[PDB]
């Protein structure tokens, strides 16, 4: 139940194939995950090709994601939630209390599963990945 933003093609975490995965779950009225975007952005760029996956995943619409990446572009894919029941699923990513934003970092061969507290940065980043890549 994901595509890109802009094409609406199929999605899906089966594609990710890093050790590590990120996935951001966001929306374009969400100040806070506003806020988070360039520094992951930014974190991003400076990964090696072959150690980490990210997705920011828009529970919201194409319309709105083209306008906000207009201004606030980012160095990783956004998709686009496609399904009806959200809280549902936010649920199978570990989101359960269902708010935004929420980033969660996973070693899915391994199961660990972590979710980010506290402000998504450089710093937050860094050591989430590293602490996965050593399950």
Same mark, same amino acid.
């Given at each position: 139940?994901?595509?890109?933003?802009?094409?609406? +093609? !199929?999605? *899906?975490?089966?594609?990710?194939?890093?050790?590590?995965?990120?996935?951001?779950?966001?929306?374009?009225?969400? /100040?806070?995950c506003?806020?988070?975007?360039?520094?992951?952005?930014?974190?991003?760029?400076?990964?090696?090709?072959?150690?980490?996956?990210?997705?920011?995943?828009?529970?919201?619409?194409?319309?709105?994601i083209?306008?906000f990446?207009?201004? +606030? !572009?980012? *160095?990783?894919?956004?998709?686009?939630?496609?399904?009806?029941?959200?809280r549902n699923?936010?649920?199978?990513? /570990?989101?359960?209390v269902?708010v935004?934003?929420?980033?969660?970092?996973?070693?899915?061969?391994?199961?660990?599963?972590?979710?980010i507290?506290?402000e998504?940065?450089?710093?937050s980043?860094?050591?989430?990945?590293?602490?996965?890549?050593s399950?």
């Amino acid at each position: 139940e994901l595509a890109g933003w802009k094409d609406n +093609t !199929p999605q *899906s975490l089966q594609s990710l194939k890093a050790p590590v995965r990120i996935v951001n779950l966001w929306a374009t009225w969400c /100040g806070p995950c506003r806020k988070e975007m360039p520094a992951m952005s930014k974190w991003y760029k400076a990964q090696k090709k072959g150690s980490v996956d990210m997705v920011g995943i828009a529970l919201d619409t194409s319309d709105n994601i083209g306008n906000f990446l207009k201004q +606030t !572009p980012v *160095s990783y894919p956004i998709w686009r939630y496609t399904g009806a029941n959200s809280r549902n699923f936010m649920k199978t990513y /570990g989101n359960t209390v269902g708010v935004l934003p929420f980033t969660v970092v996973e070693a899915p061969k391994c199961g660990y599963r972590q979710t980010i507290t506290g402000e998504v940065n450089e710093k937050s980043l860094t050591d989430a990945v590293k602490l996965a890549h050593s399950k």
